[PDB]
Design a binder for this molecule. Sequence first.
Ligand SMILES: N[C@@H](Cc1cc(I)c(Oc2ccc(O)c(I)c2)c(I)c1)C(=O)O
Ligand SMILES: N[C@@H](Cc1cc(I)c(Oc2ccc(O)c(I)c2)c(I)c1)C(=O)O
Ligand SMILES: N[C@@H](Cc1cc(I)c(Oc2ccc(O)c(I)c2)c(I)c1)C(=O)O
Ligand SMILES: [Cl-]
Ligand SMILES: [Cl-]
Ligand SMILES: [Cl-]
Lengths: 248, 248, 248
Amino acid sequence: MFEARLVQGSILKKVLEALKDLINEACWDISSSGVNLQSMDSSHVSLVQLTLRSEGFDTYRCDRNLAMGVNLTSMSKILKCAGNEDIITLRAEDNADTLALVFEAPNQEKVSDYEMKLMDLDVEQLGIPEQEYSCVVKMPSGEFARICRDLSHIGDAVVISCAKDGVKFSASGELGNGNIKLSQTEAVTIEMNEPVQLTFALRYLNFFTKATPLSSTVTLSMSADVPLVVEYKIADMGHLKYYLAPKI
Amino acid sequence: MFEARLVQGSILKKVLEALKDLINEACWDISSSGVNLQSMDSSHVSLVQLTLRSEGFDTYRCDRNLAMGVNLTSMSKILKCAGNEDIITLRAEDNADTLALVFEAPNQEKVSDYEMKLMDLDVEQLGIPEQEYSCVVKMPSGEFARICRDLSHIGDAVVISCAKDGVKFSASGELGNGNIKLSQTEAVTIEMNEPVQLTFALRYLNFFTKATPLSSTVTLSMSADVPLVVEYKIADMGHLKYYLAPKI
Amino acid sequence: MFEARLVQGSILKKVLEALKDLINEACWDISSSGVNLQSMDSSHVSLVQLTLRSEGFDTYRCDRNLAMGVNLTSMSKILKCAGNEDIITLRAEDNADTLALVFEAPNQEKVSDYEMKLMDLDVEQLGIPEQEYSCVVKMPSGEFARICRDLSHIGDAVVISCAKDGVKFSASGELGNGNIKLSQTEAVTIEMNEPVQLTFALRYLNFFTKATPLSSTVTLSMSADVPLVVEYKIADMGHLKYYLAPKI
Ligand SMILES: N[C@@H](Cc1cc(I)c(Oc2ccc(O)c(I)c2)c(I)c1)C(=O)O
Ligand SMILES: N[C@@H](Cc1cc(I)c(Oc2ccc(O)c(I)c2)c(I)c1)C(=O)O
Ligand SMILES: N[C@@H](Cc1cc(I)c(Oc2ccc(O)c(I)c2)c(I)c1)C(=O)O
Ligand SMILES: [Cl-]
Ligand SMILES: [Cl-]
Ligand SMILES: [Cl-]
């Protein structure tokens, strides 16, 4: 008998806006500890992982663990019916076939309730390994978004080169090439053990940056021979992480 | 020798913006009492009725009654050439083949004049019956627009249920369903003799809401077995009314 | 060994935004005196001429005269990677095959450098004759843009009639016709020896007005039997001029 009330409901709005173009359908793993989503994107390239801890909700209750199969476009459409000031409650019965979503304001003059048909998805839980990241860059999320958008007018791929002093983003294509150098100082901070130079598809990074509204900061974690992790903190609640294998 | 000067010319701009998607061609009935338009929309579903009383114009003169056949897209295009601060004069000769439109500002530094070819439309005047509306809801026009837009992402039709205490808008479709409850308190006011529950096509309501800029308030009048009336007041001048039969 | 530093880099951004829809490819004539571009548009109708004098750059150096063949769409794409506050340096070696563009800010926290492949274009320099313009209209660039946009909803051509007292823009098409009268007074100023009445394609004027951000003023120079000149000053630096033959 799952139920979860989130006074800052706009977090859910932004979460769906940051998932709906990447994933068509995904399983929401609901448990005592919180809400978790894990899915490969629809092209089977990147893996997206969302954590929303029970403690970041204003009320939270989960009697039995649920795997809720959700069409993300549908859920996105329903969440567009919530205002940015709305208190949002999620509610599903045991062995649920629908998810209820209730939107309200403090003044209770407008109350909306939606019911979303769930899907049957017997998806398996993938193991996400832990890695030693020889290089971790924290920077303003908006500057990251800007760089990925700008450089995708030049080529399809971005070389990210990281050293103690600064981080460089480079691209090349038909028209020529470019590179963008950010020095360490919102700040740019680099925690690095060994320099890395890795190449990534801009198409996928430009999908990840739809998470920009969740945080003014993004963390890029990278190491040779493992996926890049692009991490947006969801304040006092958890995170959205995107994983992208370098181009080999 | 029709002539009409409207210092608040932006009213005409908004009137055309609220008609041009619904109607291709329509007759402007000009008479001593004022300007009236009546037309079925281009799909022959809803009826639109505009009243602009002679008294709301700053000057007004009509020697002989005229039926001006107008392509509304064309008139819309000409009215887009008026600024929002413009004084607008309409002028047509007796047995007119063209309508003149003059746009000016107080400072007279820019004066525009347009001439629009009229059309030949021998359309008959339809009788719009009077009805007893067992239920009349006054609410903010923007909230009405929001609800119709939001709910049309859920289904094609909206059930409007009205009672003393409040008004509910519901929709259902493939993805699931939703309902939006507004309580009586811009306010929400309900004057009702008997509860109504009626169903309407959202496609047409979303056309009516293009009239939103004419008023901060909309009036919904409904009764069993007669069209819904969606009414936008045009301050100190008249109205724009849209009529839509429930789905049966 | 050409190099040019422009602290107000946004001038270059606006220059490219005012050329890229009109011209695909064009030669940048670089010399001691400054940067000049001359090209027929891609339809071979209008001629565009850009002058940026060496003196308007913060530093300027040109060892040998260069004709740089540039795809303007490509250069436009690179200049979109510059911020509006950016210092912009252009750099090309002798007998250059690439153009370097460096973007920086005062605080040097972000430095970008791009390299653009040049093209081989053995275009000849066209002689632009001098003419006696019997009529010169100075007016606000935004009002010019407004008029050309508005009137292009009425017809494809604009009749520009100029007299001592004022300037009139007229258009006619299927729906009817219109004219817009501006009186002499940002001001409207007319210096005229003889009245002119000339007709011009609105499609091309609406391309010229993409230069609007370079200046709050536009100068229209016209005479019977020679092209209209539409001139946008590039403050303390030079100009962008567009030439358009009247319709005959
Ligand atoms: N589904 C894909 C395989 C695939 C599986 C997983 I688990 C992924 O996530 C991570 C995350 C962090 C890591 O360090 C690693 I190593 C992998 C990704 I990116 C791809 C296929 O079909 O090959
Ligand atoms: N033209 C349509 C018929 C049609 C005629 C009329 I008059 C209409 O307006 C109203 C307005 C208020 C009312 O109470 C009623 I009853 C009808 C409408 I909506 C439709 C056809 O072809 O059947
Ligand atoms: N390229 C075109 C010819 C063409 C050549 C030139 I030089 C042009 O510029 C001007 C500018 C100011 C003037 O007074 C004149 I006279 C011409 C233009 I407009 C057109 C063709 O192929 O016929
Ligand atoms: Cl991988
Ligand atoms: Cl009816
Ligand atoms: Cl010519």
